[PDB]
């Protein structure tokens, strides 16, 4: 409700100053007490950050900052109180943001693990994860309506570049521990990094998303690839092997929720710009993305590990969604749904970036393909297929609704004639052949008519079997 | 019998944003001129003669569409009982050219100029042409509203406002205590020229569709300050009266040192001398006790306003510093005056608001006290004549002029408080001025219903040009025009003013929208849901509903609709160019959904609600309203009685009722020159014609209404009597004076049924039934009315050709309100003898079923033009004007109805 401006003014000013000051101070520590309440001590300063009107990582600026004790209040008091008479002295044990910042930016590109850096991890980014977004609005640019109130200088050095070196920092860390066995911290980074997502910029795409994605594509090949070795090969000792599986899709599932929340805010925030103008990479990680979901749609373990995932660790997969509502001033599946599940809400927020390959002559082949599909055959059976289908691809002239399609898809500007190769129709209507073809399957799971409400005996017997 | 077409030309209307009127105490000077100098006219561009006239117009009843209407349609000045024109031949009102005597009569030409004169104080309209005078007058008008200048023009015309000032140079001297129109500009608007009541305007993209118009009203120049009649004040509040004068008097004394004022026995703005500036104690005394009067009332309108003010601090007032004006912007004499300094004090937000209310009722009060003395408003200051720029109530006062009074409050505020006083802020109480009615304040659009779609994924946009309240969706083509859309179970819309969806009543959904928002509506046929994205971000509710509407029936389909309010202005976009579209590649193009008019040679037509009240039959299933024929027994003729279905109950809708009969009574074309039974030779040659009205008893005859109404009453008010009836009188004389001619004009010709009842005790539900007559005679022209069987006073006279309908306006009271009885008396002729021709001579009352009650129903569906007059408005120049042009022809096929006489 932005209290902090007119509550903690003068002298509960220094008092929160005090807690922040204290909270932070338990860097040098290292005890069992403090291992647990990381999760509760982090959460306790992340809110606290958001709240503070003063910018205690920027001590330079704060002659300009009014909502200060420094300036409301004469030097004449804050003796009759006590006070080290200088803001620069008042915590004189955090770091500057631009020293802060530079401590992580080297220590994630150090390839460091979760255990040297529990405090950075638990405790330190989710201050900046909240310090950051509260001096973005309140510093340099900033939509200012200053026209009469442009006089005073901004007090906080918080621009853009400062958020988004922080997100691919924390994109980076993860990645760092991608692999490991435990990590409960990786949901909670997951809702920190929400909020300094939405000012990363188009160049974070290439740099960062494609790879570690790509590494949690071919991970989850490789696991699948186990899991259908084992089935093709029945046995008693399937079942040791089973748990094997079971345990590598519960990592890939913490790995997909340690993500997937800051690609979809992501990707909220670039598809204006991948459809109207179109992007080589974004078309990429589609095909990355959709490879992910075609095996959770076609192998049962990753579904039922997406699911045991989020229950137990309650993930609310709702506000994930609704976050953009929210931040722009705004029952049946509350605690699951697979209409609000990640991996299908991923898809189906990146599917026109797939769509948007195929040209609408192609408008045939897809159902076409699909077909093949539904029939059960491999993505080189349909590849071969559509080769020799390849004059069935629609006529602008014999239908209407073509004519003006192609007309706007032509007008695209990075659509070239020679894009359409026979090769390359081939493969963009394959890869998104299989897409909408496992994605109707879960909104319309067709499961009904098999088992209906049948009262085969309850209604009148469940007495017996009690 | 058969609708008849024909041809016609649109007609537009132009006028200044100049409005004046006559109230109790209002601002407004009262006599007003202005010319309209004719450029080029071509008499015929089309087969219909070109139309072009000049005059008044009331800002109350004024709205000409385009297209259709009275008459032949093609409506102007003078074309209903709300304006009065001038065409160089004839004085138009009420749809009828009256010829009126100039000394060489003839249709505005290019070179001529039309003089309109205004005087409210008769009130009267009068016009000369190229200096000489206009052998008519319109005189005894209503003066319910605002007037504006006007001029009504078809295709071909080339005119030029002349306003005075620097707003065109007048050709001819206004007549003596005439003030020209340029000076009754408000302080707040710059002088233009615009439309009347447009639902449509050009824009950037394409065309912009506009809500009402927010409008002015006679009483709004009233100035109302609040009451002081309490002169009851704290004797410690008293005191500080006096002083609270003197640390003001220092203040204002102080800014006019600001402004280079210095001391002299003179007392001038431009002179700069001033005796008051030396100090608050040298300043005289006489002179300080000039604004004792308005000072008590700073310290009484708290009180009035119920804010709470009394003796915190007396100490404070005895130590306080005090601010003294610098020995460098110095004044002759040589003493510094000390107002109080103030600088240690501040004021709370809610204080804040206090000294905007006070500084309103001091100005209220200042404006009121010079308006009894005979000062007016005038964008041209003017002393010896009492004109004034600041002589305006205190909301159309300028911002620059506003600030100035709110900052001398504000120190008046501040040496309360600087006394250390409690001024304690009145819990603010809300109030909702309703300016318009309850039916012009939203104007849906709605496409054709030739383009309903059952079936396939649409898509279309709606950019919210303005930030209010404006509701975009799906409806269904039954949709209602007056009722608010999504109130009830025909529309599917998205409020963007607040973020709701709107479906049978109202649920939270999405984010409020800003200028240039683009939401755009998709419909999916397939799935039964309804998707809106606001700038290419899909809307969701309070959960992860990704649709605002599921589980719809298509049933007879969706049509694209939109609603505005007053002063909305919104773009909305159907796809006809799929390039023109902003969001739908981003979202809705990959998805499936196309435009909707994708694949259409024409833009899609739009229909749009039209507040011009109509009578419509009662409907066979009205919630609250029967009516009911009874034959004709042999003690009673043919009766149409009207019951109320849901008196008393619960949620029974009592309001005022207008009630016509389907078919009217036309007057001859020529008048004549200057027991019980009916004898056979009299009753085959008369010409009166009667019904009567029996009013039941339970229903109050203070709360009915009998008579008559032209075919031109579209009065839907809800506190009607007979002094809102429309009139005016058109006089004509010779080269001086001597009226021959003083014809009287109305829409409405009724009689109260409170002047029929005595002043008993007590009683006024009487046992016995109000039996209210009217008698018609054709062929000359008179109207009269019968009691109980006993004449009436009131009377009446009408032109010949003039179409009456019988009428009957009640409020009711009971479950028997009234009965149309359709019969006849002793040698008189029933009304169905007058209505139909093959009974003209049968003398037995009939009731046909052509014959029927209808009602008055506020807002009608009506077809958008496809095309619009181009007219071109600029101002030529300090000496010419402002210009009106328009060239380009426009015609449409007209269906009229006879007996209605509207098209």
Known sequence: ?466 | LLLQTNLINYVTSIRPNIFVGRAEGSTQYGKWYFEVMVDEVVPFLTAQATHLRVGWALTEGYSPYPGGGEGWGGNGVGDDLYSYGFDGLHLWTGHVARPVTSPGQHLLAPEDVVSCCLDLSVPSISFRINGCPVQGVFEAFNLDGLFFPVVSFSAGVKVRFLLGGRHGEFKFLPPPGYAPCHEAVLPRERLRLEPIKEYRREGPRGPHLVGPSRCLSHTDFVPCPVDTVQIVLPPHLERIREKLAENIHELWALTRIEQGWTYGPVRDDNKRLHPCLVNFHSLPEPERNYNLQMSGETLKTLLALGCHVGMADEKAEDNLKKTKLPKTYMMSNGYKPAPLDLSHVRLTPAQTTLVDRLAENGHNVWARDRVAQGWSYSAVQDIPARRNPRLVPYRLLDEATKRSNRDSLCQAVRTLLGYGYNIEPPDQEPSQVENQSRWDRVRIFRAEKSYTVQSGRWYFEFEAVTTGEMRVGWARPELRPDVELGADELAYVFNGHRGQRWHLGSEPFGRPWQSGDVVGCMIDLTENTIIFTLNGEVLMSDSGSETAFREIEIGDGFLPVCSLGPGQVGHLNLGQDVSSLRFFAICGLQEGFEPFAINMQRPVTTWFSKSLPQFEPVPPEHPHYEVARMDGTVDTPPCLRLAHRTWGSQNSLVEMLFLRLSLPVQFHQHFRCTDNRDDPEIILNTTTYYYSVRVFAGQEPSCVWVGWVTPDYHQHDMNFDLSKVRAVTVTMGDEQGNVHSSLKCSNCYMVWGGDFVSPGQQGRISHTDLVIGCLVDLATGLMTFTANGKESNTFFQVEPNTKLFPAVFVLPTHQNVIQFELGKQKNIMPLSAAMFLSERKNPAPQCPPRLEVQMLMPVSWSRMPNHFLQVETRRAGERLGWAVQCQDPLTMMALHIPEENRC
């Open chain 1, 1 to 466: 409700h932005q209290f902090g401006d007119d509550v903690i003014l003068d002298d509960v000013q220094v008092s929160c100053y005090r807690t922040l000051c204290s909270i932070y101070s338990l860097g040098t520590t290292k005890n069992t007490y403090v291992e647990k309440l990381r999760p509760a001590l982090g959460e306790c300063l992340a809110r606290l950050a958001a709240a503070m009107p003063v910018a205690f990582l920027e001590p330079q600026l704060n002659e300009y900052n009014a909502c200060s004790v420094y300036t409301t209040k004469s030097p004449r008091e804050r003796a009759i109180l006590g006070l080290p008479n200088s803001v620069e002295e008042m915590c004189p044990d955090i770091p500057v943001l631009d020293r802060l910042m530079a401590d992580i930016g080297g220590l994630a590109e150090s390839g460091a693990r979760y255990t040297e850096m529990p405090h950075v991890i638990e405790i330190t980014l989710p201050m900046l994860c909240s310090y950051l977004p509260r001096w973005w609005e309140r510093g340099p640019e900033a939509p200012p309506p200053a026209l009469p109130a442009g006089a005073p200088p901004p007090c906080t050095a918080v621009t853009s570049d400062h958020l988004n070196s922080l997100l691919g920092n924390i994109l980076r860390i993860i990645v760092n521990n991608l692999g490991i066995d435990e990590a409960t911290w990786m949901k909670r980074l997951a809702v920190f990094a929400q909020p300094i997502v939405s000012r990363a910029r188009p160049e974070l795409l290439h740099s960062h998303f494609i790879p570690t994605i790509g590494r949690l594509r071919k991970r989850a090949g490789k696991v699948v690839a186990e899991e259908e070795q084992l089935r093709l090969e029945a046995k008693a000792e399937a079942e040791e092997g089973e748990l094997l599986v079971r345990d590598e899709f519960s990592v890939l599932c913490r790995d997909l929720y340690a993500l997937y929340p800051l690609l979809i805010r992501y990707v909220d925030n670039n598809r204006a710009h991948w459809l109207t103008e179109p992007n080589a990479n974004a078309e990429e990680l589609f095909r990355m993305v959709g490879e992910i979901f075609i095996y959770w749609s076609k192998s049962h373990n990753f579904k039922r590990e997406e699911q045991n995932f989020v229950v137990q660790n309650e993930i609310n997969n709702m506000s994930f969604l609704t976050a953009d509502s929210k931040s722009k001033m705004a029952r049946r599946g509350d605690r699951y749904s697979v209409q609000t599940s990640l991996i299908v809400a991923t898809l189906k927020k990146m599917l026109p970036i797939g769509l948007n390959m195929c040209a609408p002559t192609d408008q045939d082949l897809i159902m076409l393909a699909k077909t093949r599909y539904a029939l059960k055959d491999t993505d080189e059976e349909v590849r071969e297929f559509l080769q020799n289908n390849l004059h069935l691809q629609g006529k602008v002239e014999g239908s209407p609704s073509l004519r003006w399609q192609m007309a706007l898809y032509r007008g695209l500007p990075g659509r070239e004639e020679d894009a359409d190769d026979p090769e390359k129709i081939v493969r963009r209507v394959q890869e998104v052949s299989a897409v909408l073809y496992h994605l109707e399957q879960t909104e319309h799971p067709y499961k009904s008519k098999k088992a209906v409400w049948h009262k085969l005996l309850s209604k009148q017997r469940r007495r017996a079997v009690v």
